[PDB]
Design a protein around this ligand. Structure first.
Ligand SMILES: OC[C@H]1O[C@@H](O[C@H]2[C@H](O)[C@@H](O)[C@@H](O)O[C@@H]2CO)[C@H](O)[C@@H](O)[C@H]1O
Ligand SMILES: OC[C@H]1O[C@@H](O[C@H]2[C@H](O)[C@@H](O)[C@H](O)O[C@@H]2CO)[C@H](O)[C@@H](O)[C@H]1O
Lengths: 138, 136
């Protein structure tokens, strides 16, 4: 199983459900490879986004100088160790108050709802990933 | 064993020298573990910094909402998987520093001060430091 990218899917995300997204980072085309996941409150792509999750597959490295006490122009790059992306499982579990965000089974964040989870109507997954599965589990 | 952190060291950085820093990241005490290396142009706390290298050991993740076409308050965290020991080499060339992590060149930083202006090295934040040396 392999899915097109960008991937768009009508969804219903009640409390207790989890959005499972598995894939592999593609590190060979862009300098800052990332994964982006959007929960839309409607079906047009000008509808509101109740929740966006963006994950950078590299490590940020930031370089600058400080002259007269003032930090100057920041130069940034993304350190990519290994050019084989590690496969990942993204799990977004829907709780009453928040989305519980898990990467490879490890909770990294709890994003408090800014819309009722019932208002989410569509999911979009795209950028620098080879997509293996996208499903709604309970 | 670990060298003291912060680690501060008077240095001379001629073209052709490399700043070699090895150590292991410490991932268990702060949400955003980093390594910070500063090249100072004098020996004082207030001195100018000719070059700062800051590396995040985690993967940044950013979350937000978009309402009425406007992105709102961005919420940020860092995914820390699995730290493996690292080697950072900052190679001093005529026109730039060549930044090397684990033997991989990741960036060429154009000099903003003459590298002869650098007088002091400082290394600190979330690392167990193994070696700091300058080799020519
Ligand atoms: O660029 C080096 C300096 O950055 C400062 O933090 C930056 C930071 O990189 C950025 O994300 C922004 O949001 O805040 C600061 C820019 O004003 C550090 O505090 C400073 O010590 C230097 O590292
Ligand atoms: O929340 C991330 C958000 O960034 C967008 O670009 C923004 C950005 O928030 C900001 O730096 C600046 O003000 O311009 C844009 C509008 O605010 C991305 O377009 C979007 O996909 C998100 O990733």
């Amino acid at each position: 199983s392999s899915l097109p990218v960008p991937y768009t899917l009508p969804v219903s995300l009640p409390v207790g459900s989890c959005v499972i997204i598995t894939g592999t980072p593609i590190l060979t085309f862009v300098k800052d490879p990332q994964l982006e996941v959007n929960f839309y409150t409607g079906m047009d792509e000008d509808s509101d986004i109740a929740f966006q999750f963006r994950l950078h597959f590299g490590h940020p490295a930031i370089m600058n100088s400080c002259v007269f006490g003032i930090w100057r122009y920041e130069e940034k790059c993304y350190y990519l160790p290994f050019e084989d992306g590690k496969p990942f499982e993204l799990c977004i579990y829907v709780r009453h108050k928040e989305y519980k965000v898990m990467v490879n089974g490890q909770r990294i964040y709890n994003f408090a709802h800014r819309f009722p989870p019932a208002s989410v109507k569509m999911l979009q997954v795209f950028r620098d990933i080879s997509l293996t599965r996208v499903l709604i589990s309970d």
